[PDB]
Amino acid sequence: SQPIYKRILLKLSGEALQGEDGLGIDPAILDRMAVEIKELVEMGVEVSVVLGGGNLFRGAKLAKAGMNRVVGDHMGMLATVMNGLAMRDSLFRADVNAKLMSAFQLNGICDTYNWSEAIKMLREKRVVIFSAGTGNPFFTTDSTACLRGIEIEADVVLKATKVDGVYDCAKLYKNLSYAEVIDKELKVMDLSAFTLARDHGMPIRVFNMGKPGALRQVVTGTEEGTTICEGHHHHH
C-alpha cells in the first residue's frame, strides 16, 4: 500500500541490533535495518529513530554488586550514542541522509538535541536518530520514544519488539484502547511512558521488527501488530 503516516518515531531496543551471538552490533542486521528505513524514506515518510543500549550494556550484575543505579543509567545512555553512531554510518552507506542528535552536547561527535531543529531536518527528509535518552536516569527508552515522538509531532510511535504484538498471555490483540491496556493489566511499556502517550493521545504500534517486511506493512496498513490508541467514547 501507500503510507498511512507522514512522520513516525521508530523505537528499537539495543537488542534489535544483536546477532545470534546475542551481543554487540551485527553489521548485517544493522544494514538490513538501514535498507528498510531507506524504503520508507523513498515512500516519502519522515523517519525519526530512538535506540536503546541493551546490546552493549546490561547493568544487572553490576547492580547486584552494588553499583549506583544513576551510574548504570548513565552508562546505558552512552551505549545508546554508540548505537546511534553505528546507525548513522549505516544509513550514510545506504545513501540515506541522516543526522544523530544527543541529549548531551557531544562536540565533534554529533548534534545536540533541539526539538525545532529536529522537525526542520525531518521536513527536509533527513532521518533523525535520537540518543542519550532524555539526559536523566530512571526513565526508560520507551519514555524517551514517547517524549521525543510528542515533541517532534510524530503521528505514531512504532515499538519494535521480537514478538508479533500484544498477547493476553495465545491470542494477539489487534486494537486496544489505553483504558483497556490498564483494565486488562497488559504489558505494553512502563507506566510512566504509557501515561505520557495516553495524556497526549499518541498512538502506539507494537510489531515484530525481526520479521523482514513487517515495518513497511506497519507503515502502509492497519493489519500488522497491535495498535494502542484513544478509545472511541470521548470526543468524535
Q: Closest CB to a copy of itself among 30 and 218?
A: 30
* Least spacing, CB of residue 26 vs a copy of itself, in Å: 8
Residue whose C-alpha is closest to residue 193's, from 153, 228, 152: 228
Q: How far is the CB of 184 from a copy of itself (least distance, A)?
A: 17
**Which residues make up the interface to a copy of itself (CB under 8 A)?**
23-28, 30-31, 56-58, 61-62, 64-68, 70-71, 74-75, 77-79, 81-82, 85-86, 88-90, 92-93, 103-109, 112-115, 134-138, 147, 150-151, 191-192, 195-196, 200
Q: Of 121, 119, 126, whose CA–CA distance to 97 is shortest?
A: 126
Q: Which residue number, 106 or 163, has a Cβ lying nearer to a copy of itself?
A: 106
C-alpha to C-alpha distances, 171 to 89, 164, 212, 223, nearest whole angstrom: 39, 10, 22, 15
Select 54 or 225, whichever has its Cβ closest to a copy of itself. Answer: 54
Distance CA 13, CA 3 (A): 24
What CA–CA distances, in Å, run from 185 to 14, 16, 156? 26, 26, 22
**Residue 104 labelled as part of a binding site:** no
Q: How far is the CB of 134 from a copy of itself (least distance, A)?
A: 5
For cell 515499538, name the residue. 159
Residue 139 labeled ligand binder: yes
CA neighbor of 196 nearest in space, from 220, 214, 178: 178
The nearer residue to a copy of itself, 126 or 159, going by C-beta atoms, is 126
Task: Give yes or no for a contact between 226 and 165, defined as CB atoms under 8 angstroms apart.
Answer: yes
Binding annotation? 11-14, 53-54, 58, 73, 134-141, 161, 167
Binding annotation for ATP? 11-14, 54, 58, 161, 167
